[PDB]
Write a protein that binds this DNA or RNA. Structure first.
Ligand SMILES: [K+]
Ligand SMILES: [K+]
Ligand SMILES: [K+]
Ligand SMILES: [K+]
Ligand SMILES: [K+]
Ligand SMILES: [K+]
Ligand SMILES: [K+]
Ligand SMILES: [K+]
Ligand SMILES: [K+]
Ligand SMILES: [K+]
Ligand SMILES: [K+]
Ligand SMILES: [K+]
Ligand SMILES: [K+]
Ligand SMILES: [K+]
Ligand SMILES: [K+]
Ligand SMILES: [K+]
Ligand SMILES: [K+]
Ligand SMILES: [K+]
Ligand SMILES: [K+]
Ligand SMILES: [K+]
Ligand SMILES: [K+]
Ligand SMILES: [K+]
Ligand SMILES: [K+]
Ligand SMILES: [K+]
Ligand SMILES: [K+]
Ligand SMILES: [K+]
Ligand SMILES: [Mg+2]
Ligand SMILES: [Mg+2]
Ligand SMILES: [Mg+2]
Ligand SMILES: [Mg+2]
Ligand SMILES: [Mg+2]
Ligand SMILES: [Mg+2]
Ligand SMILES: [Mg+2]
Ligand SMILES: [Mg+2]
Ligand SMILES: [Mg+2]
Ligand SMILES: [Mg+2]
Ligand SMILES: [Mg+2]
Ligand SMILES: [Mg+2]
Ligand SMILES: [Mg+2]
Ligand SMILES: [Mg+2]
Ligand SMILES: [Mg+2]
Ligand SMILES: [Mg+2]
Ligand SMILES: [Mg+2]
Ligand SMILES: [Mg+2]
Ligand SMILES: [Mg+2]
Ligand SMILES: [Mg+2]
Ligand SMILES: [Mg+2]
Ligand SMILES: [Mg+2]
Ligand SMILES: [Mg+2]
Ligand SMILES: [Mg+2]
Ligand SMILES: [Mg+2]
Ligand SMILES: [Mg+2]
Ligand SMILES: [Mg+2]
Ligand SMILES: [Mg+2]
Ligand SMILES: [Mg+2]
Ligand SMILES: [Mg+2]
Ligand SMILES: [Mg+2]
Ligand SMILES: [Mg+2]
Ligand SMILES: [Mg+2]
Ligand SMILES: [Mg+2]
Ligand SMILES: [Mg+2]
Ligand SMILES: [Mg+2]
Ligand SMILES: [Mg+2]
Ligand SMILES: [Mg+2]
Ligand SMILES: [Mg+2]
Ligand SMILES: [Mg+2]
Ligand SMILES: [Mg+2]
Ligand SMILES: [Mg+2]
Ligand SMILES: [Mg+2]
Ligand SMILES: [Mg+2]
Ligand SMILES: [Mg+2]
Ligand SMILES: [Mg+2]
Ligand SMILES: [Mg+2]
Ligand SMILES: [Mg+2]
Ligand SMILES: [Mg+2]
Ligand SMILES: [Mg+2]
Ligand SMILES: [Mg+2]
Ligand SMILES: [Mg+2]
Ligand SMILES: [Mg+2]
Ligand SMILES: [Mg+2]
Ligand SMILES: [Mg+2]
Ligand SMILES: [Mg+2]
Ligand SMILES: [Mg+2]
Ligand SMILES: [Mg+2]
Ligand SMILES: [Mg+2]
Ligand SMILES: [Mg+2]
Ligand SMILES: [Mg+2]
Ligand SMILES: [Mg+2]
Ligand SMILES: [Mg+2]
Ligand SMILES: [Mg+2]
Ligand SMILES: [Mg+2]
Ligand SMILES: [Mg+2]
Ligand SMILES: [Mg+2]
Ligand SMILES: [Mg+2]
Ligand SMILES: [Mg+2]
Ligand SMILES: [Mg+2]
Ligand SMILES: [Mg+2]
Ligand SMILES: [Mg+2]
Ligand SMILES: [Mg+2]
Ligand SMILES: [Mg+2]
Ligand SMILES: [Mg+2]
Ligand SMILES: [Mg+2]
Ligand SMILES: [Mg+2]
Ligand SMILES: [Mg+2]
Ligand SMILES: [Mg+2]
Ligand SMILES: [Mg+2]
Ligand SMILES: [Mg+2]
Ligand SMILES: [Mg+2]
Ligand SMILES: [Mg+2]
Ligand SMILES: [Mg+2]
Ligand SMILES: [Mg+2]
Ligand SMILES: [Mg+2]
Ligand SMILES: [Mg+2]
Ligand SMILES: [Mg+2]
Ligand SMILES: [Mg+2]
Ligand SMILES: [Mg+2]
Ligand SMILES: [Mg+2]
Ligand SMILES: [Mg+2]
Ligand SMILES: [Mg+2]
Ligand SMILES: [Mg+2]
Ligand SMILES: [Mg+2]
Ligand SMILES: [Mg+2]
Ligand SMILES: [Mg+2]
Ligand SMILES: [Mg+2]
Ligand SMILES: [Mg+2]
Ligand SMILES: [Mg+2]
Length: 248
RNA sequence: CGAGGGCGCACCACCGGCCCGUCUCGCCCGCCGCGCCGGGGAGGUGGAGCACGAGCGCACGUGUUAGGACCCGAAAGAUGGUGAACUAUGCCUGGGCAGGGCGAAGCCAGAGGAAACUCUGGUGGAGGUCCGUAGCGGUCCUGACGUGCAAAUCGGUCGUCCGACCUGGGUAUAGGGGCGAAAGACUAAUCGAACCAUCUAGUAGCUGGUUCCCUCCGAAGUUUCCCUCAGGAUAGCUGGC
RNA sequence: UGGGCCACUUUUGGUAAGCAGAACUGGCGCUGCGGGAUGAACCGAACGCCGGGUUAAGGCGCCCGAUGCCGACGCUCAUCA
RNA sequence: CGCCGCAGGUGCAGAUCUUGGUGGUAGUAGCAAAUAUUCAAACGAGAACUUUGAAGGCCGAAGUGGAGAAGGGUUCCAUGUGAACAGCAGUUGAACAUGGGUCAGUCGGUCCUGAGAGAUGGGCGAGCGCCGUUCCGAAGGGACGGGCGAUGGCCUCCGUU
RNA sequence: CGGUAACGCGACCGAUCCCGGAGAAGCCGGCGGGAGCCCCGGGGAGAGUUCUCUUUUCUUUGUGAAGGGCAGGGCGCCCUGGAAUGGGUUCGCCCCGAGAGAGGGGCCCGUGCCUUGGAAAGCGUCGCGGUUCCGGCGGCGUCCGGUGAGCUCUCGCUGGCCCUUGAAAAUCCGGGGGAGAGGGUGUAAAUCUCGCGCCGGGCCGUACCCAUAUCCGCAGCAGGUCUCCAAGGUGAACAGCCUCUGGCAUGUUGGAACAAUGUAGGUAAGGGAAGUCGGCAAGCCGGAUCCGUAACUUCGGGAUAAGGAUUGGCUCUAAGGG
RNA sequence: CAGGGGAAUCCGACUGUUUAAUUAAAACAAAGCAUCGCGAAGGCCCGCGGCGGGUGUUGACGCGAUGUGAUUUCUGCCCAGUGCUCUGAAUGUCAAAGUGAAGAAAUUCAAUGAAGCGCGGGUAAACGGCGGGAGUAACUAUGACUCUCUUAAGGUAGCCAAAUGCCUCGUCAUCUAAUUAGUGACGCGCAUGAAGGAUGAACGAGAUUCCCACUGUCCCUACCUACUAUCCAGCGAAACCACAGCCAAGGGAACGGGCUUGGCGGAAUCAGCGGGGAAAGAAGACCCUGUUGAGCUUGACUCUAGUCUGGCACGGUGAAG
RNA sequence: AGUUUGACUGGGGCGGUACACCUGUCAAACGGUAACGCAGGUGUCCUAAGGCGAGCUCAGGGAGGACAGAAACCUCCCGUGGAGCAGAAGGGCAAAAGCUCGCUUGAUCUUGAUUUUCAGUACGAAUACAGACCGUGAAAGCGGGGCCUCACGAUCCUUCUGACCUUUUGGGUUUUAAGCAGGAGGUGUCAGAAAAGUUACCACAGGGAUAACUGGCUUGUGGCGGCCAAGCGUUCAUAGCGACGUCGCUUUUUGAUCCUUCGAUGUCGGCUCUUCCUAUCAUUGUGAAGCAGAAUUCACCAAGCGUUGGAUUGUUCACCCACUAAUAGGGAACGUGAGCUGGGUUUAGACCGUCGUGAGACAGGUUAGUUUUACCCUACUGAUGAUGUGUUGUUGCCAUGGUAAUCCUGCUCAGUACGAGAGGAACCGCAGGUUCAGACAUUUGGUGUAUGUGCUUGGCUGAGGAGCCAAUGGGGCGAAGCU
């Protein structure tokens, strides 16, 4: 009879992202004339740590092509780039780690960093540390490119979508065991209020569908249908299978 | 005074008769409309009817009922508001935490090794590390107290004491909502749904109460029906006229 | 009012019950009074306020009104009458 | 106030009834957490408690010391009173009465932004309004620079418009 | 305008615009500098003890801000030069042909010292006048040293930790660039972040308590309520115990007694958990030094395992430095 | 100032957290392990409403939803049931709208056929589940073995009178003089068992047993100290109170202070005391009744936000059919 | 989100339906008459098992007859029904009401009256008529269902049937709809709501109309006795027992009941402490024996005195160890919680097993879980006093009340009596002990703040000396007093 946890997360109040010390939105530069027809050279000025993100951010300074000013970008750092390096963004940029260039003008096996989901926005795909997307096949007609996402899914996107060449830095961060509950506390203190997770079976029936009982048991199939209302769909949501994944 | 006789009020029992409905039987009658027209009879039966009216208005009493409804009494439900000065959690900005024990990596030297490397002594100072202050907490005495110092305190003994640590202030989340390392915990001594006002004199077959005198009469706890079994309706028993 | 209960007798269940359930009349409930020491229901008797007389059931050693009869005939001794 | 009529918010022992008052309990329970007081004097009607002096102790710098924030709001300071109050007392008081006291360019506020709050545009909404905070806005009212002029005047020439 | 340079000098033309800096950054460790305090040896001044001793014990014995100069600390600053037989160097580290060691310079901080302030003030003493109750007047003094893993602040250097990387904005400044402006050789112009001079700074708060009596808890309530400073002895120590500065009157009463029962605290022959649901409660142990430590183990631990010895006072003797 | 120690069993790995005011724990959390959803026109969630809002200054080494609970070692069989999910296959049922027919129309009938449900696959680290009866070896006793009935599969590795075993104080051994306790062993286990089983150091104000030491826990009590209590001066409540207050028996609403019969009864008081006053505290919380509730659950009845799907409108321009 | 989650009931739940009906009985010779009284039955069945008429006689038995037998069919005789009539039971029935045939649809259309239940309401069922239309029989007649007693259902709604019926809203026609009358679709909780759980997180109004704990009645059950004496006891009923039967007592078992208490009588066990009972374990005095002694057993007077220390268990119980003269049984609100304790049960946290889809449940296990108040009256314990002898004092008496001692061992008797032997007492006497009681401090022990005297740590008074502080600083020894 009480609003469950997870339902309370959408209201935002306490479950909002801890963005006080974050360094800004990590994005490619907005597509313009120089990047659409040639290349623009920028210099990597600093590589910084973004709180709540396990991927380094690269501060890249460009020249404004229309007024006497310096533009500062906050690229997602591909592994191997260093401060003082020159990065080149545009259609005519060559294949090097850190350069930003459209996927349609790339070989058939190149693997990219900060992929655009739509032709014009900033990077949206393969942004988490150690991740990348592979270019599978182009087709000169209808301006389409097929890419492999970190999840293994295949996606068809426009050939005009831009991406950084290489793999985002941060490597195998998940390989290290956290070991200590406190280390997980510090990890999630810089992210949001989500970490100390109470099991639903340990709750009372009023605050969870799995709550209650003289033994801690679910009492009903944990797999729940897709169209179940909020406050009910807990457990394995719309699960195609359960068990152990033996075979793939 | 009077055997007998007569007219007989009201009222009662009965038998006839009349009006409307409905059945059964059957034969006649009427005409500006001759009709799928209209009317009439006899015999049963249904009616809160007729059969030389008794009503209307006003007052008083009793009884039943709807209303706050003889008086006081819920657990609840709804509407609209006020609270995060306590606590719960997130964020912002500050402040704080004796003295010791153990002795991780890294480093130096010596020694033994063909190599691979090994041994010894120092150095170093790691850790949700140990003993233990302040702080924070609250195990046991099931101690004190228990109309207390106190609507949760006190004594000793205890857990932890560089961390998921303690804490001020500023902020955010508000009631079927919040918040919860989860005890249905906490949300201003109130929480298995806060507080305030109103709907509201909420309802109660249940509990408690129900105020002067004398005189006369005087019970029932049984019948039948009831989601009836602590209650009603009904007949019975009572009183009054 | 629609909770009844009790007694003689009849009577069902139960080992039985100051239990449970019927029949009949009376009673208590609603009822005081005399007697049963005491007691809702037993026995007598039902009640305005009194005087006198007499009784009912029950009593008459003393408490405590009445045998303080020269009462009648027997029975009985109990170191739990 | 009686009598004839009229009309009631018309009669109390109860309701763990309402309000007010008063008993027994009873001069009883009690005035027992943190070692501790004593001598002399003064004022005074009055001294275990006030003041001074002397002595003995305690807090023992993580104080029973010296200063602040929050909160309180005159409790601060003198003089006086001695009704009540300070659960004994008081000649004392944070009591009562009468007066007095808080002085800033340089200590804070003020200014900045933080987590956040919140108009306007817009959107929604029966509506009070609330959503949203850059989003669906013609969102810059400013500037030493230059020009056209007014010469406003110590019209040389610099300030104005 | 000067210096090879780091950079220096008192100013040192310059707008729109652009770039950068400061503001502006966690926690912890180890060292080093400075100060305040503490300590020790003398010199004064005033007190205390003097039964005997004590050249004794106690108190006290200043120099603000802001300038100038000098120490001291730091530098990931410059010049010469070119290093293996590698060398410098820290407690640890760490550093070097991307320029070590060495020599010579530059800069930053300078809260330390001296100086102006400054002794005239303050303080300590000894007197003298009175102005009911003079910032009265006067004399003398306010001195020399030494120590430190000492405590507290502060500054600096160098490390460690993070799947944690520890604000923003007002505000101020430097630079780049050079649109412009300035004057015709004058006792000159534009201009000036140099020295001195002139004027102004409004508004609100400001007393006191800050707690076993000024706040909340119905109260002068053993509760609660955020901070700063922090002496001597013992000791590992912000422990406990005693003391100095400062504070107080025993916590909303006193007096007399010393029954039971209690609350709090001790002791108890012999036995030693037989008590009790149960060793509850109490008791035993305990610091430091020297030994000595098992099973098991995730090899880290267990571990102060367990067990044993010693511990005072006094007189010395060695060793550890500048 | 200032650790009693040792040998074991159970549980939780540890540090951490928790019912302010009776439960600090074995409960919660945790790292680790496993599963599920989602590529943004998205997953999950808020929102009366706006193409509103949170995750999100995010992008699969990420967010969201679950279970289990360090390490070690393992995690067996069952997709019949209920869930979940997957492609629709000639395909069954299936609303509104639309189509056709009859009628004078209301209307009636028929054809067509969205999701869903049926049909078919997958899935147990989803919920859950994991059998009986007979005969049989050259002493007996068991039963390696053999027959059948039946399931979706018939409990595997392990573990055990365990915090899980009724019978039960199970049986045997050890610990004691004596043990419903402990430990070790056995196992047809009423009713053990695999994301949880079985272990294993360190740790624990966790539950249990024994041993050394220690003692007033006890035999068996005594003495002392402080503050009370006590008495006094001052000050000064409250709870409670039908009236009250000595007993035995009787009867009685079946346990009297009062009534009957008897025993008896002597002012006013002080310190104690805990037998009575069925003492006080509260309109019993247990239990039942009420056509009185509330918290919670669910194929109870009746609904509903949200969601999936069809139709109409916004809603247009061209071709292949 | 809202709501519901029946009733009865020897408490509720579970179980049953005694909730609507029918038969016999209860039931006490009219009728009626109750309990979760007894024995049973019903929610149907039947175009015939309905209606007429006719003709037969049934169950069973005896005697006969090829296969044929205990039963196949045929025949005769007896046959009061001992068969059958659908079913439960009861009643009724013989040229019946049964069996077999023939013809049929009175199981049809109608209005009233009445009986049964009863309020003299309804439904259902039934009785007697009356009016039609029929069936059957020669006819009288009989028949509107079943031989009789049961076999069933309101309003609202729906559906069908009937009247050349009424209305359909200004008139008319036609659909439609509404109506009038009669059937049907059903309410079995059967006079007729539409309805699942859980709560230990719980709430309210009540209930002693009603359970759990005391008391009360009862005494089946438990416990303890008695009568008879078939037997046991080598033999011998009765030393000691006591079958089959039968009579009691007790209230320390457990039931039965529900009278008191639900505006509350604190709910197990232990601890502590007092008193009471006797149905006597021991001890005193006795009787009996299958009593030689020793030991043991039975019984009497008898409750004065005693009846213990421990291991496991919360236990009450139980069991074992050991001592003992003996280790008897019980009551007092299952004595005793303002006496304690809190181990158990019995709140809220939590784990396991089983059950349940789930919430949650479990006389299943486990772990943690606030035990409040006396100063009132009485009772009791002690302490002053009070009334009467004029005041006051000393010394006394005793009414009345209380009451207290207990048990064992060793030596001697005595290796005696007795006995084959083994073994093996007693009376007097002596020495001591146990439990209890009343005191006491010479001794020993304990206490010790004489704060008495040494020692000693830290600090403090300038040192010495003398002291003090550290809530009794610590420690050794310690008078007196208490013990
Ligand atoms: K809700
Ligand atoms: K589970
Ligand atoms: K009325
Ligand atoms: K309000
Ligand atoms: K609410
Ligand atoms: K009833
Ligand atoms: K009535
Ligand atoms: K820290
Ligand atoms: K303040
Ligand atoms: K005294
Ligand atoms: K013990
Ligand atoms: K810790
Ligand atoms: K704990
Ligand atoms: K799972
Ligand atoms: K399955
Ligand atoms: K399945
Ligand atoms: K613990
Ligand atoms: K509730
Ligand atoms: K009869
Ligand atoms: K009914
Ligand atoms: K009996
Ligand atoms: K009984
Ligand atoms: K009872
Ligand atoms: K009760
Ligand atoms: K006991
Ligand atoms: K002594
Ligand atoms: Mg969790
Ligand atoms: Mg829980
Ligand atoms: Mg739920
Ligand atoms: Mg659950
Ligand atoms: Mg679990
Ligand atoms: Mg007539
Ligand atoms: Mg009337
Ligand atoms: Mg409601
Ligand atoms: Mg606030
Ligand atoms: Mg707050
Ligand atoms: Mg630690
Ligand atoms: Mg620790
Ligand atoms: Mg405590
Ligand atoms: Mg206590
Ligand atoms: Mg009222
Ligand atoms: Mg009301
Ligand atoms: Mg009904
Ligand atoms: Mg009543
Ligand atoms: Mg009644
Ligand atoms: Mg009745
Ligand atoms: Mg009766
Ligand atoms: Mg009555
Ligand atoms: Mg009468
Ligand atoms: Mg009478
Ligand atoms: Mg009488
Ligand atoms: Mg009598
Ligand atoms: Mg008499
Ligand atoms: Mg007489
Ligand atoms: Mg009135
Ligand atoms: Mg009155
Ligand atoms: Mg007193
Ligand atoms: Mg006192
Ligand atoms: Mg002191
Ligand atoms: Mg202070
Ligand atoms: Mg003052
Ligand atoms: Mg006073
Ligand atoms: Mg005042
Ligand atoms: Mg100076
Ligand atoms: Mg050099
Ligand atoms: Mg001077
Ligand atoms: Mg320049
Ligand atoms: Mg001030
Ligand atoms: Mg206070
Ligand atoms: Mg207040
Ligand atoms: Mg004191
Ligand atoms: Mg005092
Ligand atoms: Mg005070
Ligand atoms: Mg002793
Ligand atoms: Mg001893
Ligand atoms: Mg014991
Ligand atoms: Mg014992
Ligand atoms: Mg202890
Ligand atoms: Mg060990
Ligand atoms: Mg733990
Ligand atoms: Mg584990
Ligand atoms: Mg806590
Ligand atoms: Mg608590
Ligand atoms: Mg606790
Ligand atoms: Mg694991
Ligand atoms: Mg997890
Ligand atoms: Mg499978
Ligand atoms: Mg097995
Ligand atoms: Mg087992
Ligand atoms: Mg075992
Ligand atoms: Mg034991
Ligand atoms: Mg499995
Ligand atoms: Mg009595
Ligand atoms: Mg009484
Ligand atoms: Mg009540
Ligand atoms: Mg109540
Ligand atoms: Mg009812
Ligand atoms: Mg409800
Ligand atoms: Mg359903
Ligand atoms: Mg019922
Ligand atoms: Mg009769
Ligand atoms: Mg009869
Ligand atoms: Mg015939
Ligand atoms: Mg009925
Ligand atoms: Mg709970
Ligand atoms: Mg009763
Ligand atoms: Mg014989
Ligand atoms: Mg009572
Ligand atoms: Mg009581
Ligand atoms: Mg009582
Ligand atoms: Mg006897
Ligand atoms: Mg008892
Ligand atoms: Mg108690
Ligand atoms: Mg008692
Ligand atoms: Mg317990
Ligand atoms: Mg519990
Ligand atoms: Mg067990
Ligand atoms: Mg506890
Ligand atoms: Mg007193
Ligand atoms: Mg006598
Ligand atoms: Mg005696
Ligand atoms: Mg000393
Ligand atoms: Mg000396
Ligand atoms: Mg002192
Ligand atoms: Mg002290
Ligand atoms: Mg001694």
């Amino acid at each position: 009879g009480r609003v469950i946890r997870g339902q309370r997360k959408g209201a935002g109040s306490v479950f909002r992202a801890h963005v006080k010390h974050r360094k800004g939105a990590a994005r490619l530069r907005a597509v313009d004339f120089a990047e659409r027809h040639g290349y623009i050279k920028g210099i990597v000025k600093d590589i910084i740590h973004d709180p709540g993100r396990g991927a380094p951010l690269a501060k890249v300074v460009f020249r404004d092509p229309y007024r006497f000013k310096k533009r500062t970008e906050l690229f997602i750092a591909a592994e191997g780039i260093h401060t003082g390096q020159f990065v080149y963004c545009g259609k005519k940029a060559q294949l090097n780690i850190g350069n930003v260039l459209p996927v349609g003008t790339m070989p058939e096996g190149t693997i990219v960093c900060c992929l655009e989901e739509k032709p014009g926005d900033r990077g949206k795909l393969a942004r988490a540390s150690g991740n990348y997307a592979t270019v599978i096949s182009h087709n000169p007609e209808t301006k389409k490119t097929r890419v492999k996402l970190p999840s293994g899914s295949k996606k068809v996107i426009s050939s005009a979508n831009r991406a950084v060449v290489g793999v985002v830095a941060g490597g195998g961060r998940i390989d290290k065991p956290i070991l200590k509950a406190g280390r997980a506390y510090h990890k999630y203190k810089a992210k949001r209020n989500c970490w100390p997770r109470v099991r639903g079976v340990a709750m009372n029936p009023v605050e969870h569908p799995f709550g209650g009982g003289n033994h801690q048991h679910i009492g009903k199939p944990s797999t729940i249908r897709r169209d179940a209302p909020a406050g009910r769909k807990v457990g394995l949501i719309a699960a195609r299978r359960t068990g152990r994944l033996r075979g793939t």
